[PDB]
Amino acid sequence: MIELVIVSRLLEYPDAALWQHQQEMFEAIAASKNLPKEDAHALGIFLRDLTTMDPLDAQAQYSELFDRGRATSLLLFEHVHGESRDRGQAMVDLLAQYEQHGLQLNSRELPDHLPLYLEYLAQLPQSEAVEGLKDIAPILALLSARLQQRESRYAVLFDLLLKLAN
């Protein structure tokens, strides 16, 4: 699902490459087949709001929101498993599930890093990707809920992912 890649990029630390490929993304969002017209609009609003900021200023807001705290962490297993040892085995089992689909970590991010996990989902058949979102949907909803409390438009990206889940 191109939508899953698109959200994966928008949910990551705002990279300069976002600004120089905004045209490509705006068009992909516009021609989206998996999102109703109103949600594609909301996603395009988000991208436009993001890339009218200077990346340095986008990066600073992102960190104030996702890198300062645990309640807004993008490591999924930090929301699933309370014991650190449980998280470990979960990460291993997720790494193996990646290896099963012929995918190998080529990053310095953890396996349950949501943007990374979305990249994995996007490689799957439609149904296989949709189940993935259903699997983490209580996490998606908590994060969205929390972001709304902080009155942050990143919540939009979680609602869109939840929408894609049904």
Partner: peptide
């Protein structure tokens, strides 16, 4: 190559 078709976290085996 289109941006959205370039991997950012993974590679093939």
């Amino acid at each position: 190559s289109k941006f959205l078709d370039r991997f950012r976290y993974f590679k093939q085996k």
